[PDB]
Amino acid sequence: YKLICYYTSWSQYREGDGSCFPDAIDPFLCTHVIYSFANISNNEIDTWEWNDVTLYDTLNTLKNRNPNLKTLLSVGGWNFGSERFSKIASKTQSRRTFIKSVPPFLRTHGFDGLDLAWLYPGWRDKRHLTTLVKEMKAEFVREAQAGTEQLLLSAAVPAGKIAIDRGYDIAQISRHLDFISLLTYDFHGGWRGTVGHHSPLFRGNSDGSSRFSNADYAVSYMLRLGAPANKLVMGIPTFGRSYTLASSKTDVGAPISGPGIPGQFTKEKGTLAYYEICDFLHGATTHRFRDQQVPYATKGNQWVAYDDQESVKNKARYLKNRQLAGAMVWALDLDDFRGTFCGQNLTFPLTSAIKDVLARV
Numbered sequence: 617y618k619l620i621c622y623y624t625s626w627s628q629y630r631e632g633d634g635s636c637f638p639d640a641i642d643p644f645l646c647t648h649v650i651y652s653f654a655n656i657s658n659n660e661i662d663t664w665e666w667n668d669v670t671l672y673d674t675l676n677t678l679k680n681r682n683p684n685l686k687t688l689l690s691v692g693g694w695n696f697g698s699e700r701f702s703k704i705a706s707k708t709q710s711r712r713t714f715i716k717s718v719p720p721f722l723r724t725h726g727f728d729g730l731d732l733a734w735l736y737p738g739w740r741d742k743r744h745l746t747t748l749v750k751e752m753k754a755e756f757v758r759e760a761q762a763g764t765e766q767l768l769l770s771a772a773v774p775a776g777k778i779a780i781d782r783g784y785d786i787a788q789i790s791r792h793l794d795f796i797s798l799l800t801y802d803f804h805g806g807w808r809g810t811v812g813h814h815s816p817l818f819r820g821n822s823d824g825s826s827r828f829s830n831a832d833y834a835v836s837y838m839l840r841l842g843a844p845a846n847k848l849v850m851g852i853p854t855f856g857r858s859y860t861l862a863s864s865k866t867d868v869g870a871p872i873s874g875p876g877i878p879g880q881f882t883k884e885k886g887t888l889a890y891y892e893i894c895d896f897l898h899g900a901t902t903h904r905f906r907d908q909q910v911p912y913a914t915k916g917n918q919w920v921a922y923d924d925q926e927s928v929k930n931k932a933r934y935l936k937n938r939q940l941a942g943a944m945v946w947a948l949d950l951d952d953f954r955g956t957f958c959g960q961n962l963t964f965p966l967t968s969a970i971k972d973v974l975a976r977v
């Protein structure tokens with residue numbers, strides 16, 4: 617089984633224990649670690665953070681301890697204008713220059729592959745995404761003639777039904793990618809004046825309008841569209857989403873006035889790292905959706921939807937039963953990487969729980 621784990625560049629700037637450097641990553645925890653977000657300048661892949669070149673080095677040294685560990689660099693991301701990706705891929709001239717620049721860059725900094733994080737191509741881009749993947753892979757195949765291990769090519773893909781149909785020719789890109797990570801954790805969040813869970817595993821017989829907004833449906837849909845199970849990786853979040861209650865109602869369908877208050881360390885409205893949630897739980901009321909099989913907690917006027925060891929192991933058992941390639945974890949830096957916030961002095965409690973299930977099966 618594969619255990620793909622993302623590490624984010626900006627997590628280094630979090631104050632106190634919140635600060636996370638590649639240095640803190642256990643070399644034997646994940647099978648693949650992806651450094652989150654390279655930029656594109658002059659139509660060539662390039663660094664993002666001022667000290668990325670150093671961090672790349674720190675991350676890749678982990679391979680000295682675990683020679684089997686693979687690392688990839690992800691291009692794109694949320695702060696990267698999709699319109700920018702669109703303009704690059706749409707023009708053969710720009711596209712070819714970008715593709716040409718990747719292998720040398722990856723080789724120079726010690727990466728074993730590239731992860732495409734074009735966050736949301738429109739319907740006009742679907743065709744160009746396919747071309748980008750095909751041509752990028754053809755270049756990786758050609759570069760391997762030089763005697764080195766062929767570069768890996770992966771892509772992060774949203775799990776939303778509409779998003780998939782609109783910009784992804786799954787049947788086509790699946791044959792060129794080494795693995796596809798399904799972002800099965802963005803099924804809810806703010807845009808609606810109601811409370812809800814962003815990463816439910818199952819539909820939950822309750823509501824009906826959105827029988828497509830759960831992990832099980834997304835996985836089944838990808839399998840139907842042509843993505844081979846041995847190339848599909850299910851995304852499991854290590855963070856939680858927070859909301860500010862508009863009333864004293866906390867049950868399903870409770871009104872919302874907006875995202876929750878920022879966390880002490882992550883300082884981003886609407887999200888909390890798992891280590892922040894562990895602190896939040898003290899004095900909070902915990903609940904769990906039996907149908908969706910995911911928990912949520914409330915305190916004062918704050919409502920949090922998250923994943924714990926149990927929900928995470930459950931999702932791991934699920935992808936195993938569906939014979940998928942493995943699991944993907946968004947943000948090792950959002951898990952209790954120090955292991956000093958969530959009681960048990962266990963570092964990476966969420967990621968380790970996933971590894972445990974995958975290790976059994």
Ligand SMILES: *[C@@H]1O[C@H](CO)[C@@H](O[C@@H]2O[C@H](CO)[C@@H](O[C@H]3O[C@H](CO)[C@@H](O)[C@H](O)[C@H]3NC(C)=O)[C@H](O)[C@H]2NC(C)=O)[C@H](O)[C@H]1NC(C)=O
Pocket residue numbers: 655656657658664665700
């Ligand atoms: C990722 O790469 C992009 C593209 O190289 C980079 O953004 C670009 O940065 C340029 C220089 O900072 C911007 O040009 C600036 O300078 C020119 C001439 O001096 C001005 O005419 C522009 O108005 C000015 N730009 C701005 C926004 O003020 C260029 O416009 C900008 N383009 C884009 C699409 O962003 C970006 O900084 C880099 N990301 C990081 C984190 O370094």
